[PDB]
Design a protein around this ligand. Structure first.
Ligand SMILES: C=CC1=C(C)/C(=C\c2[nH]c(Cc3[nH]c(/C=C4\NC(=O)C(C)=C4C=C)c(C)c3CCC(=O)O)c(CCC(=O)O)c2C)NC1=O
Ligand SMILES: *[C@@H]1O[C@H](CO)[C@@H](O[C@@H]2O[C@H](CO)[C@@H](O)[C@H](O)[C@H]2NC(C)=O)[C@H](O)[C@H]1NC(C)=O
Ligand SMILES: *[C@@H]1O[C@H](CO)[C@@H](O)[C@H](O)[C@H]1NC(C)=O
Length: 570
């Protein structure tokens, strides 16, 4: 055995860290509904992990490179566990969830939550516990990648180093699996499960204001991190201050390293943003929210991604590759991924033709600007709230904003069918089997586009496999181009850059440039602002895919320069 024992312990810690991350990112809606926490504060609670990890991922990645790396990893996992337990803590202190607990809109002739929440948050509201409990995860997660991997790449064999990193990044996928299954098994248990008799709880997952046993999940994450930290306290050191600024200057002055950091920042920002908004893209362009984007995609994706990471490691090992070799392999990965992106632009469909946003409500003449579209002879008599968004589809295949705007005055209502009838707007032609009708929901797109949806899913799985075939190349190329005694600080600073400029900023400006294309903004009662109901299909696609491809092209260009400069140096 030997280093293999540390490898197993570090794999367990990877599982714990990924499970913690996903189980924090899966309980946002639950906690929010049981805490009188304005979404704005929920964003801050979620960013607690970042504000904790950033201030430390360097100060512990250099000072730890000299003092018994395994014990530091163990203290880190133990801190992560205590953080999870302290996150689940507030459930035993507060009271019961006693605060547990239409609009057909046919046409015819103050801060209350924050106010009560603020009152509830008059002092240090219980929410702070979660925030801090989450921040601890940061302070505990940081000595795993920088302080662990260095160890391996400094105590392994000459070529083995890579296969291990592949095995670690491929076992870390057992994290999201156990997280998803344990959440969807636990998000079905009422918040106060065991305390209250579950036969009286009226609220249901189908109904609103339902809260599950959220304290049990963070508790599980905590117990799992603690059980993963127990083994680390037994491995040995070696299995056989005006210095910090000095080393940091000598690692930033290194041209190859800063060039590679900028490159990986660009590329990883592009991926992260693409995978953050790919679901909204699939929904807005084709019209398949969860037809194939459902858990199925997850169970078919996880084995692919794991196989990608492991094959990347194995190919870096089996096929002996020098530093230039790893650079060329990563560049080939980037070329294949960018070719797939530049393929995506050929899989596109027509725009969602909805009355009032792209055409006049009559459906005859297209309108240029959706702002100030005049009402037609359909409804000028029908008092219709123009801000309401209730997509309905008639026999003509045209989507409408609201059944009121549809020109309808009747609906099944209590009866199960959603059909509407008698509406001047659907009356486009004559003697054409004009049995005016309308079903609830957006117009389902013709088979010609759902067929392209499968092309999209296929090339997306292929591009995720080809981008996971190189996900074990960044760390190796970083450890190889930095001086031998600075690997940990290199990995730490690189994780800082990747997380603080590709995990916090990339979704932000992607969301901004995407919201540049919104056509209908849910106006709010407190303000005209809100979420977006629909995006212009072709313009949203263009903006999103174009920004992603531009980032990828800048990345690939840097790769060329880097491989060049590197081949010049060596
Ligand atoms: C439909 C299938 C499905 C998927 C794919 C899923 C999660 C999922 N999303 C991503 C991409 C992936 N990767 C990152 C981030 C990073 N990646 C990095 O290597 C670094 C250093 C960062 C920075 C923090 C993000 C944010 C996402 C997309 C997350 C999401 O929006 O779901 C991965 C690959 C690992 C990863 O990149 O973290 C996984 C397992 N859940 C599902 O149900
Ligand atoms: C829907 O609209 C039609 C037309 O206004 C309503 O009825 C009639 O149409 C047929 C054929 O022209 C005839 O019975 C009369 O000319 C119309 N008057 C009525 C009310 O009988 C029909 O009743 C409406 N049905 C609804 C309310 O869904
Ligand atoms: C209208 O009549 C046609 C037959 O001409 C029938 O197929 C269709 O289901 C009817 N639709 C409505 C709205 O009743």
């Amino acid at each position: 055995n030997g280093l293999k024992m540390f490898l197993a312990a570090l794999s367990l810690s990877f599982i714990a860290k990924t499970l913690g991350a996903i189980i924090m990112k899966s309980s946002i809606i639950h906690i929010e509904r049981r805490f009188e926490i304005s979404s704005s504060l929920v964003g801050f609670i979620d960013g607690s992990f970042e504000i904790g990890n950033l201030l430390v991922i360097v100060f512990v990645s250099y000072f730890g490179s000299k003092l018994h790396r395994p014990k530091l990893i163990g203290i880190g996992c133990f801190i992560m566990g205590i953080g999870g337990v302290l996150t689940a803590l507030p459930h035993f202190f507060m009271g019961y969830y006693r605060y547990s607990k239409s609009t057909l809109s046919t046409c015819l002739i103050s801060p209350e939550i924050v106010g009560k929440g603020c009152l509830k948050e008059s002092g240090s509201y219980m929410w702070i516990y979660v925030f801090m409990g989450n921040m601890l995860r940061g302070i505990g997660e940081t000595p795993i990648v920088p302080l662990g991997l260095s160890y391996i790449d400094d105590f392994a064999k000459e070529g083995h180093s890579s296969l291990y990193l592949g095995i670690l990044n491929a076992i870390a996928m057992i994290g999201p699996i156990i997280g998803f299954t344990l959440g969807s098994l636990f998000s079905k248990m009422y918040v106060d499960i065991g305390y209250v008799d579950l036969s009286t709880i009226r609220i249901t997952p189908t109904d609103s204001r339902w809260v599950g046993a959220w304290w049990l999940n963070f508790l599980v994450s905590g117990l799992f991190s603690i059980i993963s930290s127990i083994p680390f306290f037994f491995l040995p050191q070696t299995p056989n201050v005006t210095g910090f600024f000095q080393s940091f200057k000598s690692i930033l002055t290194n041209p190859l390293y800063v060039m590679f950091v900028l490159l990986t920042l660009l590329q990883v920002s592009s991926y992260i943003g693409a995978f953050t908004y790919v679901f909204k893209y699939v929904e807005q362009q084709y019209g398949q929210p969860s037809s194939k984007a459902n858990i199925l995609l997850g169970v078919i994706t996880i084995p692919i991604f794991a196989s990608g990471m492991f094959l990347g490691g194995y190919i870096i090992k089996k096929f002996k590759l020098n530093t230039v070799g790893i650079a060329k392999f990563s560049c080939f990965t980037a070329v294949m991924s960018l070719s797939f992106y530049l393929l995506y632009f050929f899989i596109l469909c027509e725009n969602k033709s909805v009355a009032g946003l792209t055409m006049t409500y009559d459906g005859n003449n297209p309108v240029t600007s959706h702002r100030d579209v005049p009402l037609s002879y359909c409804n000028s008599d029908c008092n219709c709230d123009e801000s309401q968004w209730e997509p309905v589809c008639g026999n003509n295949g045209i989507t409408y904003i609201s059944p009121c705007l549809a020109g309808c005055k009747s609906s099944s209502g209590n009866k199960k069918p959603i059909v509407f009838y008698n509406c001047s707007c659907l009356e486009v032609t004559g003697l054409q089997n004009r049995n005016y009708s309308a079903h609830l929901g957006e117009c389902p797109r013709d088979d010609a586009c759902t067929r392209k949806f499968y092309f999209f899913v296929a090339i997306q799985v292929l591009n995720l496999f080809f981008s996971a075939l190189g996900g074990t190349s960044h760390v190796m190329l970083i450890v190889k181009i930095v001086q031998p005694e600075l690997k940990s600080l290199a990995l730490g600073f690189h994780s800082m850059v990747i997380r603080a400029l590709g995990g916090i900023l990339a979704p932000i400006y992607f969301g901004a440039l995407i919201d540049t294309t919104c056509i209908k903004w849910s106006t709010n009662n407190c303000g005209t602002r809100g979420s977006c109901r629909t995006y212009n299909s072709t313009s949203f696609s263009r903006v999103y895919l174009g920004l992603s491809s531009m980032l990828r092209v800048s990345s690939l260009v840097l790769y060329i320069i880097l491989i060049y400069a590197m081949k010049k140096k060596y």
